[PDB]
Copies of this chain bind each other. A is one copy, B any other.
Amino acid sequence: GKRIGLFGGTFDPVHIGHMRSAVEMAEQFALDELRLLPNARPPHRETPQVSAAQRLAMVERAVAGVERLTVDPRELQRDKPSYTIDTLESVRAELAADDQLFMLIGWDAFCGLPTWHRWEALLDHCHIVVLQRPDADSEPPESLRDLLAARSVADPQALKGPGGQITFVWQTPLAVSATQIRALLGAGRSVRFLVPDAVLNYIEAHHLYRAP
């Protein structure tokens, strides 16, 4: 079958930290394709004058003609900050049963997994790949002890089947943050080379994140 990744994020904006992390994990997992999955949030949770539509277009600009990288907009086509399990169920019915699904998770996010909705059917539909980094600790709550026990494999190449396991991977992400880029733009400064050149171009063309 195919090997599909899912990379979820707010992407406000998408930057080279995200993009370098998606290139790397596609290569480490030999994915057919890695889908960036821009997250839904309440409209008043959006950066003022940056719509969920423009977060979407910037990711689109980001993956434009990039090998093995796509954008899944399906959470933004819903109605509210839906559930990842809904997204997992929806992607699944579009895949073959032998296709394998990998959902990229940052360590800090994974440590709150039992605070997600129906969090125990997640692995029913995919494998979870948890992003280890310089910063984000690596000792989970007891709440996750038995999950790691029943489901983790230490070799990311070890993952078998369409879904069901958890592995860990290591990246050294460039130290680039959406918050820092928003601050620079607000001060009329250049975020050139902090973001993909096509995303830069979109941000400048549409004059995004500009000081009130």
Contacts and interface: CB of A to CB of B under 8 A. Distances in A.
A119 to B, nearest CB: 8
Contacts of A176: 174
A156 interface: yes
A44 B30 CA distance: 17
Contacts of A109: none
B44 A156 contact: yes
Interface in A121-158: 132, 138, 142-143, 154-157
A76 interface: no
A43 B174 contact: no
Nearest to A20: B193
Nearest to A45: B170
A115 to B, nearest CB: 7
Interface in A36-54: 42-45, 48-49, 51
Contact of A44 (B118, B169, B186): B169
A33 interface: no
B212 A188 contact: yes
A48 B28 contact: yes
Given A43-B168, A174-B174, A212-B30, A48 B193 contact: no
Nearest to A209: B187
A168 B170 CA distance: 35
Given A51-B155, A212-B187, A138 B168 contact: no
Given A42-B168, A183-B186, A187-B183, A212 B27 contact: yes
15 contacts: A16-B16, A20-B192, A23-B190, A23-B192, A27-B190, A28-B48, A30-B212, A42-B132, A42-B138, A44-B156, A66-B192, A114-B143, A118-B142, A175-B175, A183-B186
